[PDB]
Amino acid sequence: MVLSEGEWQLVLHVWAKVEADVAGHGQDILIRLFKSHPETLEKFDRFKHLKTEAEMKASEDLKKHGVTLLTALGAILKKKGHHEAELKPLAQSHATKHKIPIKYLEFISEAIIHVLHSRHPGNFGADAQGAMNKALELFRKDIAAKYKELGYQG
Ligand code: HEM
């Protein structure tokens, strides 16, 4: 797939707002993911034990990962589709070490779109959401093709 420059603009305009508070957005997104799809919490051997949203909000580790995650995602979006190099090391650790099925990357994509829609309604109207959705589908498709070359396709 190929996003037009206009679509990338809509994606990088609402991303510039996320970047004013990377850690808070990281928290929101992961919690939304763990409340909606609890099974995903099992993949984190470091968080696993958290029983409630309050415990999640108070975990420094969960907040640290959220920052790591969003920083990596932001560096991939700013490439505007030329993200081959960034995707290699990511695909290898998620396919071979963590073992994150494609389906879970769809779950966090949904959590990302839920959180932008709540926080940024004015910069996240229908067209901007369709463009973000296009940019995360692109990301999932290229990661899935790399999973396959690596022997996982999960
Ligand atoms: C937007 C998608 C994602 C991005 C950009 C992303 C990024 C990362 C990055 C940069 C790291 C650290 C370096 C590495 O291990 O490769 C990481 C670690 C990890 N990620 Fe992902 N990730 C994504 C989605 C997920 C999802 C959906 C899950 C699981 C339900 C997952 C589970 C983890 C785990 C288990 C680790 C290790 C955490 C720790 O113990 O240090 N990732 N991810």
Side-chain angles (χ1 to χ4, degrees):
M1 16 192 313
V2 179
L3 269 84
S4 68
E5 168 78 6
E7 293 177 314
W8 280 120
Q9 280 303 290
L10 291 167
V11 163
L12 298 171
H13 177 66
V14 71
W15 200 254
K17 310 300 188 199
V18 174
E19 297 193 310
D21 178 15
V22 184
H25 284 82
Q27 262 169 323
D28 281 8
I29 290 169
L30 284 173
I31 290 164
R32 162 33 74 156
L33 172 71
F34 299 150
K35 301 197 329 203
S36 296
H37 308 275
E39 63 261 46
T40 63
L41 180 55
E42 281 162 80
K43 293 274 163 186
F44 293 87
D45 290 337
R46 165 170 151 248
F47 300 140
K48 225 159 46 194
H49 59 305
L50 305 176
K51 307 175 183 277
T52 63
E53 174 167 355
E55 272 175 13
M56 284 177 199
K57 277 171 204 225
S59 164
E60 214 70 15
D61 274 4
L62 182 154
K63 163 147 135 318
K64 296 190 336 273
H65 182 57
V67 172
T68 301
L69 197 146
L70 286 191
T71 304
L73 180 59
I76 280 161
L77 292 174
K78 285 173 201 193
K79 281 345 275 303
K80 296 159 49 161
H82 296 96
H83 55 229
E84 314 55 54
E86 284 68 28
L87 239 61
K88 275 165 124 148
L90 190 72
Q92 180 172 52
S93 62
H94 286 55
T96 311
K97 185 172 161 40
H98 313 319
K99 275 71 151 213
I100 306 310
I102 288 300
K103 166 77 107 142
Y104 291 2
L105 304 175
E106 285 169 339
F107 291 159
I108 200 168
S109 282
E110 170 192 14
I112 284 154
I113 281 163
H114 171 90
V115 168
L116 302 195
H117 174 88
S118 308
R119 289 220 199 209
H120 303 294
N123 280 330
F124 208 60
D127 285 356
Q129 178 170 337
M132 184 54 86
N133 175 63
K134 216 167 146 180
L136 298 175
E137 297 193 346
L138 176 59
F139 168 69
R140 276 192 253 158
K141 163 163 137 299
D142 282 8
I143 280 264
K146 287 29 133 173
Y147 272 2
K148 180 170 210 351
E149 304 170 40
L150 292 171
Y152 173 63
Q153 239 332 86

